[PDB]
Design a protein around this ligand. Structure first.
Ligand SMILES: [Mg+2]
Ligand SMILES: [Mg+2]
Ligand SMILES: [Mg+2]
Ligand SMILES: [Mg+2]
Ligand SMILES: [Mg+2]
Ligand SMILES: [Mg+2]
Ligand SMILES: [Mg+2]
Ligand SMILES: [Mg+2]
Ligand SMILES: [Mg+2]
Ligand SMILES: [Mg+2]
Ligand SMILES: [Mg+2]
Ligand SMILES: [Mg+2]
Ligand SMILES: [Mg+2]
Ligand SMILES: [Mg+2]
Ligand SMILES: [Mg+2]
Ligand SMILES: [Mg+2]
Ligand SMILES: [Mg+2]
Ligand SMILES: [Mg+2]
Ligand SMILES: [Mg+2]
Ligand SMILES: [Mg+2]
Ligand SMILES: [Mg+2]
Ligand SMILES: [Mg+2]
Ligand SMILES: [Mg+2]
Ligand SMILES: [Mg+2]
Ligand SMILES: [Mg+2]
Ligand SMILES: [Mg+2]
Ligand SMILES: [Mg+2]
Ligand SMILES: [Mg+2]
Ligand SMILES: [Mg+2]
Ligand SMILES: [Mg+2]
Ligand SMILES: [Mg+2]
Ligand SMILES: [Mg+2]
Ligand SMILES: [Mg+2]
Ligand SMILES: [Mg+2]
Ligand SMILES: [Mg+2]
Lengths: 131, 188, 260, 167, 155
RNA sequence: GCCCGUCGCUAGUACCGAUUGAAUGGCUUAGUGAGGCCUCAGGAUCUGGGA
RNA sequence: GGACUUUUACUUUGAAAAAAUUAGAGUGUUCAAAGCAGGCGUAUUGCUCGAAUAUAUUAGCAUGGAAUAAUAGAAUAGGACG
RNA sequence: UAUCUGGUUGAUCCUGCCAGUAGUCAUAUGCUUGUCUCAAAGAUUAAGCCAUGCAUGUCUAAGUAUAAGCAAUUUAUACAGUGAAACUGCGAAUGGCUCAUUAAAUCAGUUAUCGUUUAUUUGAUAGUUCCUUUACUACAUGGUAUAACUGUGGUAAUUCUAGAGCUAAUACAUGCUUAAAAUCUCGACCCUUUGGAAGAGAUGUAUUUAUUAGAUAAAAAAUCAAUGUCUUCGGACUCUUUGAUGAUUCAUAAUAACUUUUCGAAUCGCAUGGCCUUGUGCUGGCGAUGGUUCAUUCAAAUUUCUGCCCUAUCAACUUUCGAUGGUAGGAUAGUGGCCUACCAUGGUUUCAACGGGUAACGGGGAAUAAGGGUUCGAUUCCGGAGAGGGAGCCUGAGAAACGGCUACCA
């Protein structure tokens, strides 16, 4: 008798277990952004996956439908907020585009490296977890 | 206890039902008063929510209304005479609602002869006045007046003795009296 | 199940209280009183969750047992006493008066009112019967009985009540075009006039309502509480004035007041 | 050790349903009844003890019985009971007849009396006075409210008769 | 139903508390009480004109109509003073996005103010439990005979 | 080349089957019938007809 | 207020509608799953935004539509209006 | 978030299934295991069985204190502080647990009570109680009988208790009271009219019955019986009063009586004040607890409409010993075949009744992501049911209660 603590998982795993292209594709990302997991990519794919779903849906509603206008605007401003969605391409048909790398580019890991300050994605890992 | 649920009992389709829950006291019933005549005996039963019912068993007087005369009087209850539900009720003289009784006449006689100065069947100043005002209003009714000569008046219990401890009713009259006189002799 | 239920599982609590999910398990159960369980605001809730005066429930009993808080004129010392819409809550110390009256989101708002207005209230008359010995009485939504009302007073009219005394000092008929507060349903909190009444013999008259933004909606009679004239309310309304804005309109307001 | 029970008749044991207010049982709870063994009221050699109650003294003195004597624990506490245990009429005033029990606190002897009850007092008379007052005062206030309405109703009639004479 | 006799019981049939004083010489023998059931259901003349008793009559009796007001069609008139109606309705079954004919039979009281016959559409108003099965009372006949006389003999 | 059935071996499953076979569970006739409740009585005792 | 009304399906809009879950807005729990918080100052006697919205369908209720599909009508005239 | 691959042939295209693949608030097991936060957990099988401990008790200034209890001071020779025990009151019907039963049942959404009960909370609500009505009734206040206790006891043994002696009340049981007025019945008289009258009783609330009012669909007349108010004595009656609902025999009131007569304060705490004829007179402050009736609130009980999984190797079912309806009663809080008596022959069914299965509590919901679907829900919230099995019942507003009793079975 206490309200459920709610939860949910934050990743999804590839249906095809051993696809060699997807595996090379994944590894390259890991070796670019200092990841340790295929899950750190699995996670983002999943984040993207819903964002796109939302956007697909919104798109089916009439132009300037209240929900579409309200909930689309919200999602766009949330994405521009963190630097995933460019200023020009600010109208959700491009959030319908939007790649995994656009997301990985904005992790504190990378930002800590992008303006020197670490000079290797991995030096960037170690610094961060070390206060 | 006696239970008043519907959940025993077959369904309109004729289906047998499972036992769903045990008896609760809020569907309870109790046994009949089967109230009889004579010498007051009343027990109270504690009913739902605080609350009393009074279970008359044995009764000998009731309060009886002569509707057309607009008065009521308390009389002895002579006895039961006809019952539409069960003839055993008559044979045993059980008092219930709808029972046909005979009562006493003498309280109703005394009133009538004092109020009309007429006497059924067969000198003050203001009294004379009041009587002379009345009449053209004292012309009774054959089938009621004849009863007085026997000292006994047919009446229908209109209360519920098992419920209220009262055995009350009204004198039979007109059509309703016609009806039971017929039954009485056309079964006598 | 054998008798009167005596607890209230938090989650089964009404939502317009705005209790949190965790931190506990139960919510307070409104004592019996003038207002129904699910359309009430227990003192505990008001003294702690809105006014923030108490932190504990323990300190609510402490505040209350010194007879600090008094409702509708009278003192009241029940932690979970059922306060409700139109009632008046007073803190003599802190020199503060309150009226319980709704948001636009359907909640009970914290609403400071002046000391004078703090000495009367409005009552929807809920029934008008002939009582024993021929004395006619009215009954208002907060369960007051008032003997000898005005013969013109009928059910659904609102009524201005002294408080200091028991008596009525004015009433307002349920007519086409009178200021209305909506107390129940989705449109809980909305305010606006009355366009017209749908009849429907044998169940639920409908009251068509328009506000001061030329916006329209409907509720069951039941949910309609007369409170004055187009313009003239008979009590002060909370800020917002019961108008309800779209989520867009409310977004734009909130992000219009942005520059510190 | 089972007790006898007046009126069973019988000279053995039986098990009875006992209730509130009865020998050989003390209910633990409202409406509790317990089935319990009981010994009959006829004496046989199976008894461990008889209980006897001297009704007439004999030709000689029983030791620790006739020759010793034990005072009642408590005295009359209720007003009129003090009256009767001294025979006093309602004139004597009780407070001086109430019993007082001495008791030593080392080198201080104390004196504690009951607390008379149903004692007629000023404070009681004050509360009798008040009640009688409220009834009447209310009652008078209750016609007034009726009369004020009867007016309101009557001078409504004279507005629906002056309206019926306007048009 | 009723028909004939009216006084055909062990118990004398009367409307309660509707006293007719024998002393007062009236010209209609029995004083009769009736009411307007409400919702604009005309209390038919056969009830006011009537002499039948029936304490379950919506117009001359001790019941009341309140709650559901359903219509259905008469399917059995074997019970003395009560009938059975069939209420058809199509029940929507989502997965197939189509419907199936269903029905329910419903027992209802029928005042001898009415002359119902199998085939009539009848409007019934809910009342208090009147018997084990019956929660409804025929309140108006939205029918007649369904063209009975128009099948008679030859030319 | 493929291939059918009887006959013989090992192992497994289910069927039939004297035992008017056996077990569990739900209802249930007839007979016996605790207990409390209600009721006709009773009256240890104990009061002013009543407990 | 009276006096009387062929009967259905379908569709629309709306009322009545528990929270939690779900979808989803706002908010940088250090991130996040969460939570419903929180955010500004004179941080010495206080100011302030919230705690949305959507879905909730079968049935019942209330309103608009009159296509599609049923039902009923006047022929032994016991037809219609006055 | 609309994807498939391996396996039949010599090779081929098919059909088709087996296998692979991915998720699972989906359980187990194995191996391995450092940190943060979060945190389910004897449901599945056996609603099988349970050692021991705990899970229900409770006191305000304000019901009861002579503890032979503690405390002393502080005005207290009735009591007065504090307070064990005990009586009284309230609570133990909530909560917590489980999922055996249960398939039109429960449950959901939606209804109904003009079909009832309702401790409590809240707001209203009570001038009437006696009596052949001058030698008058305790109201400045009526009765005992009990716990605790003291003391004599019993039994191996329990929250076993007996005999004897005390004493309380907001326990038990009794029992007085208050203004004026009007309306009714009676009626000593007196006098004949058109007729009038002193004075006598009755009329709180509740209970039970009978009777009446509770108008209103637009307007008018005559007559019979009783009989009101005003005569400019042939006559007139003029103004005439009416609540709610869709609907009532509704709310409310009036008449005649009824009742082993319900309620109408014999209670408690603080303050002690006015007033003059100086009675310890007569008044009198704030609020506690109670009290009948109505309303309200927390409820409850029934209840309308529609909606359940598999099954025909279940087709007819229902009245034995109620099945379906009618009348009357009885019983209930109350409707109702709920039960009984009389009477009738009804009620359901291929639009699947009835029966069987369920390793079935129902719902909010969960899992699976093109869509349509498929599968699951013992389990944090709502509803229901149960306490080893059955039944019975005491108390009480509320239980057919099991951390209550009684009986049977185990
Ligand atoms: Mg009996
Ligand atoms: Mg509470
Ligand atoms: Mg209604
Ligand atoms: Mg006292
Ligand atoms: Mg029949
Ligand atoms: Mg809709
Ligand atoms: Mg929500
Ligand atoms: Mg192969
Ligand atoms: Mg091969
Ligand atoms: Mg080859
Ligand atoms: Mg497979
Ligand atoms: Mg288990
Ligand atoms: Mg479990
Ligand atoms: Mg096993
Ligand atoms: Mg002391
Ligand atoms: Mg529970
Ligand atoms: Mg005694
Ligand atoms: Mg008492
Ligand atoms: Mg009239
Ligand atoms: Mg009226
Ligand atoms: Mg009535
Ligand atoms: Mg003084
Ligand atoms: Mg088979
Ligand atoms: Mg019957
Ligand atoms: Mg038959
Ligand atoms: Mg089939
Ligand atoms: Mg099961
Ligand atoms: Mg299931
Ligand atoms: Mg479940
Ligand atoms: Mg299970
Ligand atoms: Mg139970
Ligand atoms: Mg067990
Ligand atoms: Mg059995
Ligand atoms: Mg039990
Ligand atoms: Mg329990």
């Amino acid at each position: 008798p206490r309200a459920p603590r709610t939860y949910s998982k934050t990743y999804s795993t590839p249906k095809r277990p051993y696809e060699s292209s997807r595996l090379d594709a994944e590894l390259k990302l890991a070796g670019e952004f200092g990841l340790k997991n295929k899950k750190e990519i699995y996670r983002i794919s999943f984040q993207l996956s819903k964002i796109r779903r939302a956007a697909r849906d919104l798109l089916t509603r009439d132009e300037k439908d209240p929900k579409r206008l309200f909930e689309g605007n919200a999602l766009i401003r949330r994405l521009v907020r963190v630097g995933v969605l460019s200023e020009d391409k600010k109208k959700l048909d491009y959030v319908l585009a939007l790649k995994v790398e656009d997301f990985l580019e904005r992790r504190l890991q990378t930002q800590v490296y992008k303006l020197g300050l670490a000079k290797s994605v991995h030096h960037a890992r170690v610094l961060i977890t070390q206060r | 206890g006696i239970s008043r649920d519907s959940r025993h009992k077959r369904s309109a389709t004729g289906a047998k039902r499972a036992q769903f829950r045990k008896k609760r006291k809020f569907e309870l019933g109790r046994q009949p008063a089967n109230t009889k005549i004579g010498a007051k005996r009343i027990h109270s039963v504690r009913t739902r929510g605080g609350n009393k019912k009074y279970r008359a068993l044995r009764i000998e007087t009731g309060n009886f209304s002569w509707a057309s005369e607009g008065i009521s009087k308390k009389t002895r209850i002579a006895g039961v005479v006809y019952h539409p539900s069960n003839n055993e009720l008559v044979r045993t003289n059980t008092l219930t609602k709808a029972a046909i009784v005979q009562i006493d006449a003498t309280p109703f006689r005394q009133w009538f002869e004092a109020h009309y100065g007429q006497t059924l069947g067969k000198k003050s100043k203001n009294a004379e006045r009041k009587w002379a005002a009345r009449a053209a209003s004292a012309k009774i009714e054959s089938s009621v007046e004849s009863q007085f000569s026997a000292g006994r008046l047919y009446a229908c219990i209109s209360s519920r003795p098992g419920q209220s401890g009262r055995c009350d009713g009204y004198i039979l009259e007109g059509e309703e009296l016609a009806f039971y006189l017929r039954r009485l002799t056309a079964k006598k | 199940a054998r008798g009167p239920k005596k607890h209230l599982k938090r989650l089964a609590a009404p939502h317009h209280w705005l209790l949190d999910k965790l931190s506990g398990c139960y919510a307070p159960r409104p004592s019996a009183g003038p207002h129904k369980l699910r359309e009430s605001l227990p003192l505990i809730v008001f003294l702690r969750n809105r006014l923030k005066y108490a932190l504990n429930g323990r300190e609510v009993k402490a505040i209350l047992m010194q007879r600090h808080v008094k409702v509708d004129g009278k003192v009241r010392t029940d932690t979970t006493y059922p306060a409700g819409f139109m009632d008046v809550i007073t803190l003599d110390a802190t020199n503060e008066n309150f009226r319980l009256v709704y948001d636009v989101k359907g909640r009970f708002a914290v609403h400071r009112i002046t000391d004078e207005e703090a000495s009367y209230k409005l009552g929807k008359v809920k029934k008008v019967q002939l009582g024993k010995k021929g004395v006619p009485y009215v009954v208002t939504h907060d369960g007051r009985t008032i003997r000898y009302p005005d013969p013109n007073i009928k059910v659904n009219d609102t009524v201005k009540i002294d408080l200091a005394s028991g008596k009525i000092t004015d009433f307002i008929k349920f007519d086409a075009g009178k200021l209305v507060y909506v107390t129940g349903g989705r449109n809980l909190g909305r305010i606006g006039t009355i366009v017209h009444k749908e009849r429907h013999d044998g169940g639920f008259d409908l009251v068509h309502i328009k506000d001061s933004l030329d916006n329209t909606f409907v509720t069951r009679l039941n949910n309609v509480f007369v409170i004055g004239e187009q313009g003239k309310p008979y009590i002060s309304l909370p800020k917002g004035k019961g108008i309800k804005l779209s989520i867009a309109e409310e977004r734009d307001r909130r992000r219009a007041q942005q520059g510190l | 050790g089972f007790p006898m029970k007046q009126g069973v008749l019988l000279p053995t044991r039986i098990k009875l349903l006992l209730t509130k207010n009865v020998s050989c049982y003390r209910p633990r709870r409202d409406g509790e009844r317990k089935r319990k063994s009981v010994r009959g009221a006829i004496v046989g050699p199976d008894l461990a003890v008889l209980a006897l109650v001297i009704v007439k003294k004999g030709e000689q003195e029983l030791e620790g019985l006739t020759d010793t004597t034990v005072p009642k624990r408590l005295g009359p506490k209720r007003a009129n009971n003090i009256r009767k245990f001294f025979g006093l009429s309602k004139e004597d005033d009780v407070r001086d007849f109430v019993i007082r029990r001495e008791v030593t606190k080392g080198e201080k002897t104390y004196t504690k009396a009951p607390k008379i009850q149903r004692l007629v007092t000023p404070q009681r008379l004050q509360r009798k006075r008040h009640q009688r007052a409220l009834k009447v005062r209310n009652a008078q206030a209750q016609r007034e409210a009726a009369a004020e309405y009867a007016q309101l109703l009557a001078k409504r009639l004279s507005e629906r008769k002056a309206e019926k004479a306007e048009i | 139903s009723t028909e004939l006799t009216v006084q055909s019981e062990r118990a004398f049939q009367k409307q309660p508390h509707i006293f007719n004083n024998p002393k007062v010489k009236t010209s209609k023998r029995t004083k009769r009480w009736y009411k307007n059931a409400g919702l604009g259901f005309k209390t038919p003349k056969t009830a006011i004109e009537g002499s039948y008793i029936d304490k379950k009559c919506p117009f001359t009796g001790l019941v009341s109509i309140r709650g559901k007001i359903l219509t259905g069609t008469v399917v059995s008139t074997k019970m003395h003073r009560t009938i059975v109606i069939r209420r058809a309705y199509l029940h929507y079954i989502p997965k197939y996005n189509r419907y199936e004919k269903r029905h329910k039979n419903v027992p209802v009281h029928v005042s001898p103010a009415f002359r119902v016959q199998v085939g009539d559409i009848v409007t019934v108003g809910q009342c208090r439990p009147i018997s084990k099965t019956v929660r409804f009372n025929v309140v108006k006949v939205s029918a007649a005979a369904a063209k009975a006389n128009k099948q008679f003999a030859k030319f």
